[PDB]
């Protein structure tokens, strides 16, 4: 849970959060989330990727 909260801290709001509360990513959070999505694709392709 701590890791997930830290992720939400760096990547910023969800899009569903945008429609729900009008609450969106900051520019740094936009960059963080795009990186996160590319790093989640990397783990989907390889679930055993080293830390």
Partner 1 sequence: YLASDEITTVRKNLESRGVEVDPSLIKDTWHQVYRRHFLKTALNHCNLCRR
Q: In the window 6-35, what residues touch partner 1 (CB under 8 A)?
A: none
* 39 near partner 1 (CB under 8 A): no
Taking CB under 8 A as the criterion, the residue among 2, 45, 48, 50 binding partner 1 is: 45
The conformational region for residue 24 under phi > 0 = left, psi -120 to 50 = alpha, else beta, is beta
Residue 47 touches partner 1, criterion: CB under 8 A: no
Q: Is 49 in the site for partner 1 (CB under 8 A)?
A: no
Report CA-CA distances (Å) from 1 to 4, 14, 17, 45. 5, 17, 19, 24
Task: Kindly state the tokens that stand for 42.
Answer: 């990397």
Residues at the interface with partner 1 (CB under 8 A): 38, 41-42, 45
């Amino acid at each position: 849970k701590d890791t997930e909260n830290a992720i939400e801290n760096m990547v910023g709001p969800d899009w569903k959060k945008r429609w729900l509360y009008w609450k969106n990513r900051t520019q740094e959070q936009c960059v963080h989330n795009e990186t996160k999505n590319e790093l989640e694709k990397m783990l989907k392709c390889n679930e055993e990727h080293p830390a």
